[PDB]
Design a protein around this ligand. Structure first.
Ligand code: ZN
Lengths: 141, 59, 49, 76, 112, 177, 94
RNA sequence: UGAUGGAGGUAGAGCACUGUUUGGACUAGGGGCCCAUCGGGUUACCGAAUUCAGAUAAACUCCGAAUGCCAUUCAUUUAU
RNA sequence: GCGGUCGCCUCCUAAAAGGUAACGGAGGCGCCCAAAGGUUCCCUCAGAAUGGUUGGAAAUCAUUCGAAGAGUGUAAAGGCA
RNA sequence: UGUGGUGGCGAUAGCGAGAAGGAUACACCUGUUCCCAUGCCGAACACAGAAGUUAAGCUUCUUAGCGCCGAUUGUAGUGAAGGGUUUCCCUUUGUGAGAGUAGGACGUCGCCACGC
């Protein structure tokens, strides 16, 4: 039961969301990064798998930027328990991601090893992804 | 000076071995030693003889 | 502790009013200059014994 | 086997007379709990922070500068 | 030490009073002078006033000035047909040269 | 007394011309002498408030306050409203009399003179003192004194800087280092 | 330097999605002279001035009257597309 | 249905607060030894004293809305 | 059936009037105060920095900054400088 | 015309940074016997007086650092109408969000008294 990330809690049970659109602020702290062209939850353990499959192909690392973090709690009942009584115990920590804003960032590594790391990262997330630069600003150094 | 709740103070003239700090008030009062016109015309009993004259922040 | 209590006209003897007291703070029979209807006159009032 | 399912009852607040009415004497205008609207002209405050119309007139709402709002009644 | 200035608290007391054809009075201090006005709202009009020491008051630096002022206010006001006034306390108490205004205002026409 | 005349004869115009002011209104003065008595032992004994108040009545012709708590913390065994300390303010001519009782009488009864620590200005020019004993005065009997109690003086001025306060209170005594 | 000026109209309701599929840039300009004139562009009009003469240099929005100088400020660029929206100008002098 | 006036926090970008939060600078100063039996505690964690950017809500938000609702000696059509 | 619940008050579900379910999601009640009521005057808080014997980071002081970061008998909302 | 008192208008009135002033007025300032007051203290509070000073307050002038007020299109939503996937997405019509700036902005209107 390897748990990468948690919270400080303040409420056990929570509601269940509605994904309809999600937005805010593309790549800042890096050079190369993903997107997420669909809508899903993303659990704890998928970010374990992403960290490992990123940093193994990063010899001596570089700079990897984790950007979206679990906040919300699962609940679930047992197997064989009827419908009826109150919400089952909270077991898990998930957060939602929708519509092409960015899960990870890379810097400190040339172009082909970066696309290695992102291609070998995105087979462990249930979302269709892309690969994004810093494009053009008033200044991108 | 709210009434009836305050102790004594009168110009108790001071003396010493020397230098005569004949100016101030006091608390412990009593027998007439120098009721003097150039000072307060009161009872000078505080004449205890530590000088405030000789310790070497003075001379 | 506390008591539902009644107050008495000390002149014409009618159980006029009703109030409360905490019987470990006020261990005695109260006295309040309350109005009285039968005399139309402000009257001392005491606890019924 | 839960510890919930208990509640209060809906005590039915809100504005009970619009602007521009012709309002008789002593009828309720906006039942509060906690002062959200202060009274202006001819309006009294009851025990539970309600509002009245002391004069048979016309309710029109206003503001107190920036923060909070007023009600006043103007006769004919 | 910031010695706090003294019109500010007087105006605080003014405004906590004033939140609480029958016009006002006004009562003032300085180191040396005491003024008065008779104002309506929301006309914003003084109908009469009186100086402290300017026209014909002084002849002794006591509160005796203030009794003369409180005479002059009601004397000028009664010619204008006003007997319905309301005292401002200002921002003050009633001990010094303020009851000297008030009792002079009561016994010269202004009804209370 | 002494020092009003000693201000306007020696202390004042020197400090006018040492800093070259436009008027004597910009001169620095001294307003209060704040006097604590931190007992801190009414938690132990309520009879501790006997001695300090009597000694302050011996020092100044007053009776001080009795400060309350404003906290209820068991780390010192305190509830709110518990009696802790006292306060004495001097104004008028008991300013200058007590200052001269400091300078010219009492303070040489501190053995082993290492002066007054000159880093005591509250930043912006007001002195502080923490005094360790109380037998410094001729107003004090021996057998009345039974502890190692002391005083706390905060001399409060009107000055902005620090060396103005230095030159003032050096001109008014204050055996520094 | 001399971009192609197409001065628009006042109310674009749901007509606007026709211009997003045609690759069109409706261009705000609020600045010194103009308070608001939204202006058509083709999306391949700007990139060959940004990557040719400079990413923030002088661009002239003139219809041969007075000479205007702009300072292209911001844009939202929506996800999964990488194409151009929300093009504000800023007309600052010499 | 048209016109006018108003009551009120739903759709969230939003470092106004309440909790949850990821990087950078910085130090107020401390990590078993300080390096030492007066000068650099040091490589490093550095928050609050600070601050540069980024996340986020159902019981977090100065402020909206789509006429939904209540009102008008108002207007047009209809018949309740 | 065994367990849990049965009256009242706050908050969210509640779809920007009012109103509304579930063995939905969180907390309280079955009192207290002779002043903690009425009136008339007067007053402005929490923290932080600098100094000050015992004094401990943090007993009581003094100065500066401080729109509220406090208090409001009792739970939570709405209010109150 | 300058000063003082006294009001309406959402801080566009404010906070900060700076210069000048004393004719009247205001303020600082000198005390406390008198009415009064300090849970100690003429510090305030109440009253006596006018030697002195524009240092502070106050009052006029300058400033866009902080705060405030902000328009148009530019876009999540969304009234209606519709279409395929239906967890959701899209096209006509009817209205739009603050965010982000262009800009405004170091006040306006009223009454009395004194002084020139
Ligand atoms: Zn009777």
């Amino acid at each position: 039961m390897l748990v990468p990330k948690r919270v400080k809690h303040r409420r056990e049970f929570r509601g269940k969301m509605r994904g309809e659109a999600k937005g805010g602020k593309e790549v800042a702290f890096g050079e190369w990064g993903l997107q997420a062209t669909e809508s899903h939850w993303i659990t704890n353990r998928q970010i374990e798998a992403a960290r490992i499959a990123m940093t193994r192909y990063m010899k001596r690392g570089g700079k990897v930027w984790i950007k979206i973090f679990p906040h919300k709690s699962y609940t679930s009942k047992a197997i064989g328990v009827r419908m009826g009584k109150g919400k089952g115990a909270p077991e898990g920590w998930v957060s939602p991601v929708k519509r092409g804003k960015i899960m990870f960032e890379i810097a400190g590594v040339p172009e082909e090893v970066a696309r290695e790391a992102l291609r070998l990262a995105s087979h462990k997330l249930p979302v269709k992804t892309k690969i994004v630069k810093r494009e053009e600003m008033g200044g991108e150094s | 000076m709210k009434q009836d709740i305050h102790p004594n103070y009168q110009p108790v003239v001071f003396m010493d071995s020397t230098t005569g700090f004949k100016f101030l008030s006091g608390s412990t009062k009593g027998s007439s030693e120098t009721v003097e016109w150039e000072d307060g015309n009161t009872y000078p009993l505080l004449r205890v003889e530590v000088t405030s004259d000789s310790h070497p922040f003075y001379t | 502790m506390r008591v539902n209590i009644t107050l008495e006209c000390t002149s014409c003897k009618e159980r006029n009013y009703l109030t409360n007291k905490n019987k470990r703070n006020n261990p005695d029979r109260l006295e309040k200059q309350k109005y009285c209807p039968r005399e139309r006159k402000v009257t001392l009032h005491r606890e019924t014994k | 086997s839960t510890s919930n399912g208990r509640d209060s009852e809906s005590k039915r607040l809100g504005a009970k007379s619009a602007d521009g009415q012709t309002v008789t004497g002593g009828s309720i205008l906006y039942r509060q709990r906690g002062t959200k609207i202060y009274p202006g002209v001819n309006v009294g405050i009851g025990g539970d922070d309600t509002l009245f119309a002391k004069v048979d007139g016309v309710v029109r709402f206003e503001r107190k500068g920036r923060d909070k709002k007023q009600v006043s009644v103007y006769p004919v | 030490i910031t010695k706090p200035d003294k019109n500010k608290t007087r105006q605080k007391r003014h405004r906590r009073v004033r939140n609480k054809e029958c016009p006002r009075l006004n009562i003032f201090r300085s180191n040396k002078n005491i003024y008065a006005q008779v104002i309506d709202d929301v006309a914003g009009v003084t109908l009469a006033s009186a100086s402290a020491l300017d026209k014909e008051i002084s002849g002794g630096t006591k509160t005796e000035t203030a009794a003369a002022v409180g005479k002059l206010v009601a004397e000028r006001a009664a010619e204008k047909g006003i007997k319905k006034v309301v005292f401002d306390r200002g921002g003050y108490l009633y001990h010094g040269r303020v009851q000297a205004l008030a009792e002079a205002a009561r016994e010269n026409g202004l009804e209370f | 007394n002494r020092l009003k005349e000693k201000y306007i004869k020696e202390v004042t115009p020197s400090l006018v011309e040492k800093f070259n002011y436009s008027s004597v209104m910009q001169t620095p003065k001294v307003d209060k002498i704040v006097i604590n008595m931190g007992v801190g032992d009414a938690v132990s004994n309520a009879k501790n408030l006997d001695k300090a108040v009597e000694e302050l009545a011996l020092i100044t012709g007053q009776k001080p306050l009795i400060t309350k708590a404003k906290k209820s913390i068991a780390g010192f065994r305190l509830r709110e409203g518990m009696p802790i300390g006292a306060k004495v303010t001097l104004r008028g001519e008991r300013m200058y009399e007590f200052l001269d009782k400091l300078v010219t009488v009492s303070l040489p009864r501190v053995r082993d003179f290492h002066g007054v620590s000159k880093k005591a200005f509250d930043g912006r020019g007001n002195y502080t003192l923490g005094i360790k004993e109380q037998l410094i005065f001729p107003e004090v009997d021996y057998d009345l004194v039974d502890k190692v109690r002391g005083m706390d003086i905060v001399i409060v001025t009107t000055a902005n800087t620090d060396e103005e306060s230095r030159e003032l209170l050096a001109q008014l005594g204050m055996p520094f280092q | 330097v001399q971009l192609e000026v197409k001065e628009r109209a006042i109310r674009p309701r749901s007509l606007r999605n026709q211009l997003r599929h045609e690759g069109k840039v409706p261009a705000i300009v609020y600045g010194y002279q103009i308070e608001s004139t939204p202006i058509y562009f083709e999306e391949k009009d700007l990139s060959k001035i940004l990557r040719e003469h400079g990413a923030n240099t002088v661009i002239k929005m003139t219809v041969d009257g007075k000479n205007i100088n702009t300072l292209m400020s911001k844009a939202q660029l929506d996800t999964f597309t990488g194409q151009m929206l929300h093009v504000e100008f800023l007309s600052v002098n010499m």
